[PDB]
């Protein structure tokens, strides 16, 4: 029974953007760029989470079938 | 570290002969005297079954080969380099206990692939 959510969200307005400076962000790059063992471990994390590739599905894909480039595609094909 | 190990083996991996001449608190021995003793004990012309006869005031001491674990330093260096280059430890002709078996093996070879 709310359109706008009626509960507040701890926004650090007194911190102007965010508490993250560009210097903090660029220090993440410094760790990533550095090579050696710590950068390699975080690369292994990326490869485990995302390295095995992906597949697109649409539930009821066949029913979407439409002439796009004057020829049939489903939304998954598109 | 590799250069350091090679230099360390050259100095410390092999025992070296130390002939001490003269009596302790006795008469001093000068360089020209040691030249003649050096000629007697020269490792260049000594052979495996040479024997020595001396007065009491000549001591054939030795520098032992001073034990250090260069194998462990090599294993550490190779672990550092292979992991830095993203290769498995096994690529460097170095291995580790447990990691050659079961799910520990399966993970590292999965990461490589
Ligand atoms: Mg005297």
Automatic annotation (TrEMBL), chain A:
Domain of life: Viruses
Annotated protein name in UniProt: Portal protein
Organism: Haloferax tailed virus 1
Taxon lineage: Viruses, Duplodnaviria, Heunggongvirae, Uroviricota, Caudoviricetes
Covered residues, full protein: 31 to 113 of 675
């Amino acid at each position: 029974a709310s359109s706008t959510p009626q509960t507040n969200v701890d926004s650090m307005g007194g911190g102007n953007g965010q508490d993250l400076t560009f210097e903090d962000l660029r220090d993440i790059k410094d760790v990533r760029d550095s090579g050696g063992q710590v950068a390699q471990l975080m690369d292994y994390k990326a490869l485990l989470n995302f390295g095995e590739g992906c597949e697109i599905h649409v539930e009821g894909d066949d029913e979407t079938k439409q002439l796009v480039d004057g020829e049939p595609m489903t939304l998954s094909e598109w | 570290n590799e250069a350091a190990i090679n230099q360390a083996i050259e100095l410390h991996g092999f025992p070296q002969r130390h002939v001490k001449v003269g009596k302790e608190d006795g008469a001093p021995v000068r360089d020209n005297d040691l030249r003649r003793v050096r000629t007697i004990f020269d490792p260049r012309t000594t052979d495996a079954n040479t024997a020595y006869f001396t007065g009491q005031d000549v001591d054939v001491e030795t520098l032992e080969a001073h034990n250090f674990d260069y194998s462990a330093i090599h294993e550490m260096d190779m672990r550092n380099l292979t992991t830095a280059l993203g290769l498995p430890l096994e690529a460097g002709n170095v291995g580790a206990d447990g990691l050659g078996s079961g799910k520990p093996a399966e993970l590292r070879f999965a990461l490589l692939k």
